[model samples]
Target: DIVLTQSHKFMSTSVGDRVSITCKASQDVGTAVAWYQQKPGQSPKLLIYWASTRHTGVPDRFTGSGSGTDFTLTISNVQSEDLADYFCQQYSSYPLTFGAGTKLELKQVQLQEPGGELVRPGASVKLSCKASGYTFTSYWINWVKQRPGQGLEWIGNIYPSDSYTNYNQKFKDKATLTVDKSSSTAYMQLSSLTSEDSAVYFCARWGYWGQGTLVTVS
Candidate 1:
């Protein structure tokens, strides 16, 4: 709604102190510009993707157009009630890191699984993971699942060192995968649970993510 709306609504400021705006092109994606955060207007959660900071509960602020055509930017919206409509919020804590060296560091990919895990809907637990700073047998470990308002399900992708995974066939037997390159460890086993099989499991690669693991079904 930035095509110069109402000829330009009022204008004011306050909050965590960072704002640079200039919108015009209701267009595509490119350049050093990706600031999407707003909620008073109701609904918007990209959780930032430009040059600003804040990545927990999403407060993505951005600078001017160092790489676009007068396209202003600044964005944030958070509220995660078990992933509710994730115009995203809640769970604002993790192994949050920032630019430095090594190119990547969640300590090589740590998801030994624990932030909340209590299974009693049936009983079965085997969630472990450990991959070094790089090459746990060449790329391919993406497990992402979500519930509680739902959206985002790709429960399958593993190739730690076997001819075994690519699963996404409508939730294989309800989702399961395993790996163990000596200790590069990776095992996902979620079976026959209920309460709609609650979830919040996550895994990642380049963009770096691993500070989420919640499975509760009582």
Candidate 2:
């Protein structure tokens, strides 16, 4: 599995201050990187990809940069609505992984921390389902969103197992899903949300996932 790491345990700034987060890959992933923004009660939204290209409909204030193993997601003028966690995923392989996350807060220096660290359950944990170990590229890794009041929202799913995937009717045509066989991972990103931003976000491995990171907005 390719390991993905995001820098910025906490980010703070004045209302209009710009904020940025870095996502790094364990190895060279070519241009298969994607960025997402998740506010408290809503689902994550895709912002940038292949390094610096912004997704269609994404705000100009949101930009991405970097290439190869190092990539960055920047919010030009942080807005109160932008308070949430940002994560990076690579579509380079199966058994995909995601960065812990960077929380964008409302208060100048107050940080919104994830409710808990990653919970890895050995075999007892239902979240960690074993794969058939079949053709790694045959199945797809999907990203799902679970908010406080709202149920689950299928942001998008990608086949590292095969690179073929389908999204919920709401996101199907808008979200982008991709995979990388060399690293065994899949990636997805959702964009835009209001007070509907509090929720738990997760990156899945062919329909399965590690524990989700909870994001809350105040």
Candidate 3:
């Protein structure tokens, strides 16, 4: 399994500032890097990939650049819509891995009273996507979510086999999931949101057990 590390425990940026996050591979994984963005209470959306390609329908500001062992995800002239956490994943090998995450907070340079943080009500606060001991490229990576005190919601899943995708009727209109068979990676994106988007999201290589990326929106 390749280990992935993300810089900064948390990151803060204004509504319109360029934000960047880095994902480093424990070993050389070629040009199989991908980026995603997650707003509070919403499923993740694919932003950039393969070092520098914007996924279909992604905004121009969300650009990816870099190659080989080094890569970067840059949000050019960030917008209020960009406030959230960003993550990077490597798809070059089995047991896909992701960066811890770079949380994007409202950049206010002042000492203000800290307020209570919103916590998603649920059991086991940590969410994960695990992918090990499988032919990543041969199967689809499915994403499912379990909200605090709510049942599971099928966000969507990506079949790297042919970039074919399937989503639950509830999510078909708002979520987009894709995969790259060449690199053995899958992606998910949720848009036009509300509080209902808050949930624990997972990326499964084939079945349950793939470590998922845990995110919470306020």
- TM-score for all models, in order of appearance: 0.26, 0.53, 0.54
- Stretches of model 3 off by over 4 angstroms after superposition: 108-139, 143-218
| Global fold similarity of model 2 (TM-score) | 0.53
| Candidate number that wins on lDDT, 1 or 3 | 3
Q: Write the per-residue lDDT of candidate 3 for residues 1-218, one digit (tens) a residue.
A: 56677777577888768877777778888888878776555556777778688888888888787666767788878888787777787778654556767787776442212111234433123222334467766777677665544333446666666777766666766677766555555666555555666655666542132334444454
lDDT of each: 0.46, 0.62, 0.64
Best of the two (1, 3) by TM-score: 3
What value of lDDT does candidate 3 attain over all alpha carbons?
Answer: 0.64
The C-alpha stretches of model 2 lying farther than 4 A from their native spots are: 108-218
Q: Please give, for residues 125-204, the per-residue lDDT of candidate 2 as tens digits.
A: 11221334566576656666665543345466665655677665665544566665765544443334334444566665
Q: How many clashing residue pairs appear in each of the predictions shown?
A: 7, 30, 13
Q: Worst lDDT window (10 residues) for model 3? A: 110-119
For residues 31-112, what per-residue lDDT tens digits would candidate 1 score against the true structure? 4333333222122344444433334564323233423333444322212211211111111111111111010001025343
